RNA sequence: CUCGGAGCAGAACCCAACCUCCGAGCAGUACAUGCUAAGACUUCACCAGUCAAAGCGAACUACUAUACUCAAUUGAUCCAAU
């Protein structure tokens, strides 16, 4: 990680993590499964629908993720006819 | 379970002759 | 001012046994797939074939006898030249038939061993029972 | 009130009487609810919704065969039954 | 529990082997159980009509 | 480490040294057979039965009835395998018989079966129901006299009640037709109570019809002690339980107590409890027959409730537990997207303080 | 890693949807005409190999 | 959140409301760098407006 | 040098050696090995892997039938082809 930028002297974004996982505001991650995509011919239909399922990383997990992403990409967006929107904020969670 | 009175309650190989080819 | 006839507890209890099996949402007992017969029905068409006799049994899964016919019975022996035979065993599915409609069981299930099903006795005991107008299958659980 | 309610037509109300009877009190009152939204407006809206579409279902007067339930399958069943039993008068 | 085994007629090898046991020698093997805790439903008054 | 078993152990009694001169089943039957029986022995081990079989009372049921009939075996047996020889001698019936075209006579099976094991099958099915559970605490009798409900519907048929038919409240507007067989100068009490109708209280009953100091078999003629009420079972509750039971009077008895205005449509005056009626009579009265149907709700019952009984019809709905979650975590690892959605109250966007 | 006794294949199917599902079939064995469920359609359809996608 | 700020004075309902109007009462805080294109109105509130 | 079974490790789980033995890198049958979804297991992390009620859609008129038989029978990301 770059912690001071030579020409601004601010800490950069690992953008390897910018394609491959999703924030949610209330700061889970989301991510897809590792070989989805790879040789379904083989792998069977229960299997590949765990495969194809977006699910939620760790807190170890998170903590890296976040370190490793800048504070703009933790900020609250509003985009229009967001299919996350509602994921957003938690409900109900006791601690 | 072996510590159990009720070890063995399942055995069944003693009933039958043994089968050799 | 209320009316002392519409005081209803908020909960009602109905404690008669076929209530929950009637509407199909009680338990059937699930499981015991490594062995034989199922225990997953209300009410099972149970037959058994002696050498001198044949009848046969409703039972609800707890292993009470609802009805029963057999040739044992003067009422039905007395009309028959064997109770041994493929006749017996049509004239017992008749007879268990109107029992069974008489008294409100509908349904139930038949677990046969291959060769029973097979043999034209268990067959003809069948389509009696079918044709007296109960069926031998169950209607599934409603869970939702 | 639905008999009084004369923006309906009298054989349509007739026959929603007998389709939604379950829904018509003691005093003859259609009552229609709706608890699926957090705001009153939807709430009233999808009640609404149910009075045009039962109007519309009184006059369609639909004939096509629509598929059995499974309950239903199993009252038909257990009603054949009940109408094996019935007997007749040995001296009528 | 401890229970009375019986196979499937359509098992072979389980049907061999009790064919070959000796007259009045059951077997028996373990199985678990769940007893039900809580009723399929109740029965509510929801209206007065 | 071992423990000695605390009874005799399944397969000991098998003699392994002479194994291959013992006989051996050969056929599945006959494993299951034996098998089927060993299953309905009592057992030291944890067993099945043990957690999932009705806790039956260890004292016998007292039986509350009328004497059984007194028969000579050797006269019966004599008559009984003389007409055997007579239809086995028919050549008609062998032939019939080898071509499988015979036939039995239902209506003359029924008929010998109600004068002979019918009494004992009919209590084997009110136990199955449950009537001897709620109406006596328990106690049982065999309805040794046959009892013939019948509900007239239209001009030219009848609805009979047997024993769990169903019978729908439209049928049962009216009083039913009760005949059976008394000599003269008997006397008998006739009721009818809904076991599952009761709104209010669960143990208690309602009192349909109360005849009482019947002569004879006239039904006509007894006093109505209480009036007859259709079955109103509740839209949503399930179906209902209505046994009608006959009772021998050894004496002229009065009712003077149980007697209920007419008409009596107060639900807590027709309120009953088959188990304190017939307790307080017992001395005098001994349960003879027995009938019941099965009543689940039609649009009849809405005319009882409005009409009749002057109340709004009560609607019930069959209620299922709400699904069990874990409780929800912070960090839910390698859960599906869809894990939120268990956990939220409502479906619609919120915007919180915006 | 072993002789090649069976090779993968495209089933397309027949009603037009285009919805395509790969199966194994031997090597010297006729191409596959199967009865397959077709999504699109919501019903079994005829399908037809197209294309030889590797060797199994 | 818009009947708040007119309960308060902070957005006059006596002239046209607008994107101003509603920055100059600090109903809503707008970033047009961070490409924002202004407000979306929200139904929660429709039964007290 | 990866994977599975057995002993060491006798009875919940786990357990090493250039320790002792035997195997795997497939094949065969289906063509709903369709879709979806409670609740769980998990090779001591992660990755990956595993089992599944109900439901939709099918099948069905009793082929131990609706998550095929089989122990392992296997390869991430990027990238390439389409
Ligand atoms: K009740
Ligand atoms: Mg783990
Ligand atoms: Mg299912």
């Known amino acids: 990680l770059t912690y001071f930028s030579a020409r601004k002297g601010k800490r950069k974004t690992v953008k390897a993590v910018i394609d491959r996982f999703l924030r949610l505001h209330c700061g889970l991650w989301v991510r897809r499964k590792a070989g989805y995509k790879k040789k379904l011919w083989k792998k069977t239909p229960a299997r590949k629908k765990r495969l194809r399922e977006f699910v939620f990383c760790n807190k170890t997990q998170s903590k890296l993720l976040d370190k490793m992403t800048t504070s703009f990409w933790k900020r609250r967006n509003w985009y229009v006819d967001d299919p996350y929107q509602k994921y957003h904020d938690r409900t109900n969670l006791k601690v | ?21 | ?144 | 009130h639905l008999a009084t309610a004369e923006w309906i037509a009298e054989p349509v109300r007739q026959k929603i009487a007998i389709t939604h009877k379950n829904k018509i009190n003691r005093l003859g009152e259609l009552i229609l609810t709706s608890e699926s939204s957090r705001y009153q407006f939807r709430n009233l809206a999808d009640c609404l919704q149910k009075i045009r579409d039962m109007i519309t279902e009184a006059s369609q007067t639909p004939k096509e065969p629509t598929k059995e339930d499974v309950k239903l399958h199993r009252i038909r069943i257990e009603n054949m039954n009940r109408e094996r039993l019935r007997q007749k008068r040995i001296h009528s | 529990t401890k229970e009375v085994y019986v196979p499937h007629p359509r098992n072979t090898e389980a049907v061999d082997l009790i064919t070959r046991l000796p007259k009045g020698a059951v077997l028996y093997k373990t199985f678990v159980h769940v007893v039900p805790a809580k009723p399929e439903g109740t029965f509510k008054l929801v209206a007065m009509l | 480490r071992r423990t000695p078993p605390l009874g005799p152990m399944p397969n000991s009694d098998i003699d392994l040294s002479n194994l291959e001169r013992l006989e051996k089943y050969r056929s599945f039957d006959r494993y299951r057979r034996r098998a089927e029986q060993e299953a309905q022995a009592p057992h030291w081990w944890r067993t099945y039965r043990e957690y999932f079989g009705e806790k039956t009372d260890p004292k016998e049921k007292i039986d509350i009835g009328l004497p059984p009939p007194k028969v000579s075996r050797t006269q019966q047996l004599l008559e009984r395998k003389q007409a055997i020889q007579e239809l086995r001698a028919n050549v008609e019936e062998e032939r019939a018989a080898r071509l499988r075209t015979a036939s039995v006579p239902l209506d003359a099976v029924r008929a010998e079966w109600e004068r002979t094991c019918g009494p004992y099958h009919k209590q084997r099915l009110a136990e199955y129901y449950g009537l001897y559970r709620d109406l006596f605490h328990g106690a049982t009798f065999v309805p040794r006299v046959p009892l013939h409900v019948a509900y007239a519907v239209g001009e030219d048929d009848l609805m009979p009640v047997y024993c769990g038919n169903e019978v729908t409240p439209t049928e049962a507007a009216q009083a039913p037709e009760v005949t059976y067989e008394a000599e003269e100068g008997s006397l008998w009490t006739l009721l009818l109570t809904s076991l599952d109708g009761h709104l209010l209280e669960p143990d208690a009953e309602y009192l349909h019809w109360l005849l009482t100091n019947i002569p004879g078999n006239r039904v006509a003629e007894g006093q109505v002690t209480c009036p007859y009420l259709p079955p109103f079972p509740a839209r949503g509750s399930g179906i209902h339980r209505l046994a009608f039971l006959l009772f021998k009077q050894d004496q002229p008895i009065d009712f003077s107590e149980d007697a209920r205005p007419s008409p009596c449509y107060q639900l807590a005056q027709r309120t009953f409890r088959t188990f304190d009626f017939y307790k307080k009579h017992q001395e005098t009265m001994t349960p003879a027959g027995l009938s019941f149907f099965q009543c689940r709700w039609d649009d009849s019952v809405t005319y009882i409730f409005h009409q009749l009984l002057d109340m709004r019809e009560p609607v019930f709905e069959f209620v299922r537990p709400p699904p069990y979650h874990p409780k929800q975590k912070r960090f839910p690892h390698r859960q599906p997207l869809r894990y939120l959605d268990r956990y939220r109250d409502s479906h619609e966007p919120t915007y919180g303080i915006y | 890693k072993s002789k090649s006794k069976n090779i993968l294949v495209r089933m397309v199917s027949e009603a037009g949807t285009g919805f395509c599902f790969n199966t194994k079939r031997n090597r010297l064995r006729e191409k596959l005409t199967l009865l397959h469920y077709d999504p699109v359609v919501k019903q079994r359809v005829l399908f037809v190999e197209k294309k030889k996608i590797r060797s199994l | 959140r818009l009947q708040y700020l007119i309960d308060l004075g902070r957005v006059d309902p006596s002239q046209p409301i607008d994107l101003t109007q509603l920055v100059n009462g600090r109903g809503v805080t707008i970033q047009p760098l961070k490409r924002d294109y202004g407000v979306q109105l929200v139904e929660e509130g429709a039964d007290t407006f």
Not at chain 3, 17 to 30: D, G
Not at chain 3, 63 to 81: D, F, N, P, Q
Not at chain 3, 95 to 114: D, H
């Open chain 3, 1 to 144: 001012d209320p009316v002392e006839n519409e005081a209803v507890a908020p909960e009602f209890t109905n404690r008669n046994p076929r209530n929950l099996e009637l509407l199909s949402v009680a338990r059937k007992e699930r499981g015991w797939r490594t062995v034989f017969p199922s225990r997953e029905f209300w009410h099972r068409l149970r037959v058994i074939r002696t050498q001198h006799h044949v009848e046969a049994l409703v039972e609800h899964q707890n292993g009470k006898v609802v009805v029963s016919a057999s040739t044992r019975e003067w009422a039905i022996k007395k009309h028959l030249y064997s109770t041994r035979n493929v006749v017996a065993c049509e004239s017992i599915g008749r007879v268990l038939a109107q029992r069974c409609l008489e008294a409100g069981i509908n349904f139930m299930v038949y677990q046969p061993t291959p060769w029973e099903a097979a043999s034209d006795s268990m067959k003809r005991l069948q389509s009696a029972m079918t044709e007296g107008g109960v069926v031998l299958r169950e209607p599934q659980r409603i869970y939702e």
């Open chain 2, 1 to 21: 379970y072996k510590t159990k009175p009720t070890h063995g309650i399942g055995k069944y190989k003693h009933l039958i002759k043994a089968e050799e080819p």
